[PDB]
Design a protein around this ligand. Structure first.
Ligand SMILES: [Mg+2]
Ligand SMILES: [Mg+2]
Ligand SMILES: [Mg+2]
Ligand SMILES: [Mg+2]
Ligand SMILES: [Mg+2]
Ligand SMILES: [Mg+2]
Ligand SMILES: [Mg+2]
Ligand SMILES: [Mg+2]
Ligand SMILES: [Mg+2]
Ligand SMILES: [Mg+2]
Ligand SMILES: [Mg+2]
Ligand SMILES: [Mg+2]
Ligand SMILES: [Mg+2]
Ligand SMILES: [Mg+2]
Ligand SMILES: [Mg+2]
Ligand SMILES: [Mg+2]
Ligand SMILES: [Mg+2]
Ligand SMILES: [Mg+2]
Ligand SMILES: [Mg+2]
Ligand SMILES: [Mg+2]
Lengths: 261, 180, 150, 68, 52
RNA sequence: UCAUAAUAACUUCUCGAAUCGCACGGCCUUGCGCCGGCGAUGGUUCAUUCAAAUUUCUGCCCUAUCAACUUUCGACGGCUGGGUAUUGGCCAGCCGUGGUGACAACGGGUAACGGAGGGUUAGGGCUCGACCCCGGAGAAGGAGCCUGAGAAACGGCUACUACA
RNA sequence: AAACUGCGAAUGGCUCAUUAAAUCAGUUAUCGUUUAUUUGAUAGUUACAUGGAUAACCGUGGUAAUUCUAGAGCU
């Protein structure tokens, strides 16, 4: 239609942002960056709508101009910067660090992390091949390209990133018995152990997982994200992604409420 | 039919009124950018040769160099042409311009002095006007004053004086911030 | 297929980038390297027919010894027309469901595909075709296998 | 009822208040004075009028003497 | 030019090289002593400040 | 016939920084000498992001007083090129005689933009959808083009027709 | 201030005339292509610094008429 779009209509924004249908007609329209538009976490939504540090749009950019907030150790100054999975958000003046990770309902949640854990990351690998001059390289899920990798590393694996020097320090193979977290689909946010994998020539292979409570589910290969073999490397949020049914949630809700008061 | 005479050497210009046609007969049928002798204009013009630079039609349209016609023609003037100032990138507009052949129809001629004559003009060649700006680039400053490779080009720049409105304070000096 | 001659045209027919006039003779098992006929394997459990590797025909649209890759849907049908040159028409039949009357009706569509000289195709035979890039105005599929006759 | 609910902001220093507060709130407290301006249409009308002048638009009376 | 009348321009272009040579020598030593003065001022001041 | 590498050559032929701002520092042969930090703006190739253009499968209302249609001057396919960001009867030459149809083609009507969906209800249905969300098209009617990463743009230009 | 240079003005907003396998819906492909901007990597083959123009500005004009423009002098 004679060029690219630059506006986002409210009621068309991604659902997992939890935006009220009233109070305006438009949406933040995340800018282009390392993460897809459909599944990203704009910085203005995080600062203003979740932490509630900034009252409105005008004061949200006032914080950013002071270079107070940074992601992955580098300061970002645009309010609609697309953050995504595994990203580390650090605010030094207030003194806490955040990691963007899904809960069991398929949306981003606030998750405190310690300073010692806020200095590394991990990401799924997308492709491995030879570049210009014969130098091997690989690219991760957040558009990080690194030259001279370990020849044992193949596609679909995960690598631990220093995030200070951008160097791979250890990796996990993609095979049965690994611990994985889902990033897309209806089973979004669940955590399980890979049971076995079935492949179909012509694309769209599927993997079968198993929950901690002996529940079973399946997903496409593009939505499985290995985060460990045992004792996952990152710190999982509260609930650990067990996906209680609706019956237990109301049972747990009243039990917790009456026990406290 | 008025005449616009300019003196590039002295930087002076003047406008005169001419109503007698036989003095202007020798200008007819000449082309834009040609050489003509100013003798028929008057006794004071002896020894002068003039260059035809341009003119304006009676309706106000200007002369355009490169089109051979005594009448005026419609053209599709693009960017970089003479009588067109585009308002937008890539814009092309159709306009009308008058030819480069001198004729009785035009209202004003523009011409300049090429060679000085023995006599002087009362209001044109008896006065001079100074230049406005000196050189600003580094190499041009060196060439103007014939300095050597290392002669501190900073010290040789031209600086004028200006004073405030009514403060009663002393005037100060202004300099051109040498580039390169 | 039946082809009288291989070079029967204005130009000279040859596989691209297969060099044929070398002073020194070297014998190699590789298909295209030594200077002999080149061919590839399509995949998806499709086996190269014997006629392709040892034949002399030249075709730039055959999935074997050609410059076309097969990717997309795989379909089946019955041939109804074989009266063009290296092109056939297949008939596909299915059943459409009408919800109000709770029963089905018959429908059919016609498809055009490219047939290689490796196969020999007659009327009323079942074939398996694979999708490829547009080869003509109405040809987007290529013949892959000919099912045995009853 | 006899109950009322609102919002409150507490600032570290008076200078920090004027740096982050919107101007319209300052006028309410009396700290700052109001801005005097013309109507929205008059400002727009003047803006389009200056698109027909090129260079030193402040004074443009030099063309009054062309008619003599 | 408006900045300098004609007598100024030819006076500056026709200045004899001896005057120009003196100017270079006068300027080169002026900066050298200026640089040396700043060099000694800072090195001594940091010593007394550190001591007291 | 992928990534990448090597050899013989080629080109009105590219790119590989003559650009800008803060800090005032460190060496000794003390020369208006040498070295040194963090940013801005650019730059060749690969990757990513917002995309865009084409493309596979199946699905639309009434009408036979519409039963045969398509190829003058491409209608279906083969081959060598031309053109395009690329595939392609998209176009130019040469050679075959094909393609759709009673499982409703082809043509005529539509007080017809399509869809998510609105109204009315035992179940099965009937009817409406210009209109806040998504996709397409247009700026009085037709055609042509400049600039640019992106337009056959009209709060851009050129011509004819109709108005003024 | 002015003016040159860079970027945007191809998004929004309005309307339903044309359109009956066409638009469109769900589902595939690009091993058949272009891509400003954003993000991550990445290029050893006079020099202590090269050359001519032009606008703003000064000054002289034309036409009943327009966001029309002429010729002359600086950077
Ligand atoms: Mg695939
Ligand atoms: Mg290759
Ligand atoms: Mg071809
Ligand atoms: Mg038939
Ligand atoms: Mg309808
Ligand atoms: Mg209609
Ligand atoms: Mg509608
Ligand atoms: Mg209507
Ligand atoms: Mg209404
Ligand atoms: Mg109208
Ligand atoms: Mg542009
Ligand atoms: Mg349009
Ligand atoms: Mg138009
Ligand atoms: Mg309008
Ligand atoms: Mg418009
Ligand atoms: Mg920009
Ligand atoms: Mg633009
Ligand atoms: Mg629009
Ligand atoms: Mg309206
Ligand atoms: Mg870059």
């Amino acid at each position: 239609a004679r060029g690219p779009k630059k506006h986002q209509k409210r009621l068309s924004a991604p659902s997992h942002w939890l935006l009220d249908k009233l109070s305006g007609a438009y949406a933040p329209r995340p800018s282009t960056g390392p993460h897809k538009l459909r599944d990203c976490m704009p910085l203005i939504v995080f600062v203003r709508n979740r932490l509630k540090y900034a009252l409105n749009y005008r004061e949200t950019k006032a914080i950013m101009m002071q270079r107070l907030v940074k992601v992955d150790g580098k300061v970002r100054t645009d309010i609609t910067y697309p953050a995504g999975f595994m990203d580390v958000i650090t605010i030094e003046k207030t003194g806490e660090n955040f990691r963007l990770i899904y809960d069991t309902k398929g949306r981003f949640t606030v998750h405190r992390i310690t300073d010692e854990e806020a200095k590394y990351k991990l990401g799924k690998v997308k492709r491995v091949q030879l570049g210009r001059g014969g130098v091997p390289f690989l690219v991760t899920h957040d558009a990080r390209t690194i030259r001279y990798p370990d020849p044992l590393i193949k596609v679909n694996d995960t690598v631990k990133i220093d995030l200070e020097t951008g160097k791979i320090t250890d990796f996990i193979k993609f095979d049965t018995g690994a611990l994985a977290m889902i990033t897309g689909g209806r089973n979004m946010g669940r955590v399980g152990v890979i049971t076995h994998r079935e492949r179909h020539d012509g694309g769209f292979g599927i993997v079968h997982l198993k929950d901690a409570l002996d529940n079973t589910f399946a997903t496409r290969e593009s939505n499985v994200f290995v985060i460990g073999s045992e004792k996952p490397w990152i710190s999982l949020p509260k609930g650990k992604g067990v996906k209680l049914t609706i019956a237990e949630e109301r049972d747990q809700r009243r039990a917790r409420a009456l026990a406290a008061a | 039919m008025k005449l616009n005479i300019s003196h590039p050497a002295n930087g002076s210009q003047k406008l005169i009124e001419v109503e007698d046609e036989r003095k202007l007969r020798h200008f007819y049928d000449k082309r834009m950018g040609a050489e003509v002798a100013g003798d028929p204009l008057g006794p004071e013009w002896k020894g002068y040769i003039l260059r035809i630079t341009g003119g304006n039609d009676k309706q106000g349209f200007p002369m355009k160099q490169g089109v051979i016609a005594p009448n005026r023609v419609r053209l599709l003037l693009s960017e970089g042409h003479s009588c067109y100032r585009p308002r937008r990138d890539g814009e092309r507009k159709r306009k009308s311009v008058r030819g480069c052949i001198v004729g009785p129809d035009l209202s004003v001629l523009a011409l300049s002095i090429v060679k000085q004559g023995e006599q002087d003009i009362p209001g044109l060649t008896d006065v001079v006007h100074p230049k406005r700006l000196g050189p600003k680039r580094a190499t041009k400053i060196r060439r103007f004053f014939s300095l050597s490779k290392d002669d501190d080009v900073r010290k040789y720049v031209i600086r004028r004086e200006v004073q405030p409105k009514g403060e009663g304070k002393k005037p100060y000096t202004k300099a051109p911030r040498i580039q390169r | 297929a039946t082809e009288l001659t291989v070079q029967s045209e204005r130009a000279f027919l040859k596989q691209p980038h297969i060099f044929l006039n070398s002073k020194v003779k070297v014998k190699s098992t590789r298909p295209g390297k030594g200077g002999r006929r080149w061919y590839k394997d399509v995949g998806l459990g499709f086996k190269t027919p014997k006629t392709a590797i040892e034949g002399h025909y030249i075709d730039k649209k055959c999935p074997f010894t050609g410059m076309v890759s097969i990717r997309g849907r795989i379909l089946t049908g019955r041939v109804v027309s074989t009266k063009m040159h290296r092109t056939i028409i297949i008939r596909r039949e299915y059943l459409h469901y009408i919800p109000k009357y709770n029963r089905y009706e018959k429908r059919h569509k016609n498809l055009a595909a490219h047939v290689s000289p490796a196969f020999r195709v007659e009327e009323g035979d079942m074939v398996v075709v694979g999708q490829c890039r547009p080869l003509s105005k109405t040809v987007r599929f290529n013949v892959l296998r000919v099912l045995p006759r009853t | 009822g006899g109950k009322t609910t609102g919002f409150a902001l507490i600032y570290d220093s008076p200078e920090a208040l004027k740096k982050f507060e919107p101007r319209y709130r300052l006028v309410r407290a009396g700290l700052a004075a109001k801005v005097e301006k013309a109507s929205r249409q008059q400002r727009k009308q003047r803006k389009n009028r200056l698109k027909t002048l090129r260079g030193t638009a402040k004074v443009k009376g030099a063309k009054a003497k062309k008619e003599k | 030019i408006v900045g300098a009348s004609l007598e100024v321009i030819k006076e500056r272009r026709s200045m004899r090289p001896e005057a120009r040579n003196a100017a270079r020598l006068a300027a080169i030593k002026e900066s050298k002593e200026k640089k040396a003065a700043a060099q000694a001022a800072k090195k001594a001041e940091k010593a007394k400040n550190a001591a007291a």
